[PDB]
A paper describes a structure:
In Coronaviridae, including the betacoronavirus [name]-[name]-2, the causative agent of the COVID-19 pandemic, the macrodomain is part of non-structural protein 3 (nsp3), a 200 kDa multidomain protein encoded as part of open reading frame 1 (ORF1). Evolutionarily, these viral macrodomains fall within the MacroD-type class, which is primarily composed of (ADP-ribosyl)hydrolases that are able to cleave the protein-ADPr bond. To this end, we obtained the crystal structure of the S2-MacroD bound to ADP-ribose and its analogues ADP-HPD and ADP-[name] (characterized as potent inhibitors of the related poly(ADP-ribosyl)glycohydrolase (PARG) enzyme). We identified and characterized the structural basis for the observed functional diversification of MacroD-like enzymes and provide for the first time direct evidence for the hydrolysis of PARP14-ADP-ribosylated substrates. These data suggest that [name]-[name]-2 contains a conserved, enzymatically active macrodomain that can potentially counter the host antiviral ADP-ribosylation process catalysed by PARP14, as well as alter poly(ADP-ribose) (PAR) signalling, thereby enabling viruses to escape the innate immune response of the host.
On the other hand, S2-MacroD:ADP-HPD and S2-MacroD:ADP-[name] crystallized in P21 with four ligand-bound molecules in the asymmetric unit and were refined to a resolution of 2.0 and 2.3 Å, respectively. The overall fold is identical to the S2-MacroD:ADPr structure with r.m.s.d. values of 0.155 Å over 155 Cα and 0.152 Å over 149 Cα, respectively. In contrast to this tight coordination, the other two S2-MacroD structures in complex with ADP-HPD and ADP-[name] show a different pattern of interactions, mainly due to the absence of OH substituents on the pyrrolidine ring. ADP-HPD, which retains the 3′OH interaction typical of the ADPr, is, excepting the missing 1″ OH interactions, indistinguishably coordinated compared to ADPr, whereas ADP-[name], which lacks both the 1″ and 3″OH substituents, has greater flexibility in the S2-MacroD binding pocket. While the ADP-[name] pyrrolidine ring is overall similarly orientated to the distal ribose in the S2-MarcoD:ADPr structure, movement of the 2″OH group by 2.3 Å relative to its position in ADPr leads to ring relaxation, while only maintaining the Asn244 contact to the protein.
Residue numbers in the entry: 206 to 379
Write the structure that this text describes.
Amino acid sequence: EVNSFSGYLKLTDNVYIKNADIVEEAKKVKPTVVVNAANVYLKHGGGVAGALNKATNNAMQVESDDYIATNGPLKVGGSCVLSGHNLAKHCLHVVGPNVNKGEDIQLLKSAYENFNQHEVLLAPLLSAGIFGADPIHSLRVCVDTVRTNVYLAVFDKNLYDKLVSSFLEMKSEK
Ligand SMILES: Nc1ncnc2c1ncn2[C@@H]1O[C@H](COP(=O)(O)OP(=O)(O)OC[C@@H]2C[C@@H](O)CN2)[C@@H](O)[C@H]1O
Ligand code: NA
């Protein structure tokens, strides 16, 4: 019922990847945890964050505003667990560094560390879009940091092929 993932490519024992839209995957799989690539104020404008919020008919944004009002912003590299609304049981909002604003790229390791508190997650590549991190570097940090089962949704077919191709070089390099 829950967590019925299909059609993924196995990269390691715990990291999987698929050329798919993350919202479509969540609707098909009804996962326990879906990952949002967030900013510290939980303002869902564009990217994965906008996609998930629209699919919840803006419920995610209202909940986030309420969370922020009570608790204040997240830290870069931090996370919070909120409702997954109609897409998942829970949504893990993770804030990767915004390299375009000069934030420290090493904090991407902190962001993916949050994945290790959940048995299985559907997730995007953190900081690889609006936040300006290299998608390949984001995959490297994911692969090196996450010990739990992470299912990565990469919607662009050209990016998917480049990531898989670059991953092979990473394994044979050392
Ligand atoms: N709907 C999508 N399904 C699967 N993958 C997606 C989807 N939309 C974007 N992506 C990809 O997921 C990766 C992460 O991109 P973003 O969603 O912009 O995340 P990020 O760079 O951490 O920036 C977070 C900001 C925080 C808010 O301002 C809105 N987005 C990139 O490779 C995107 O091309
Ligand atoms: Na699936």
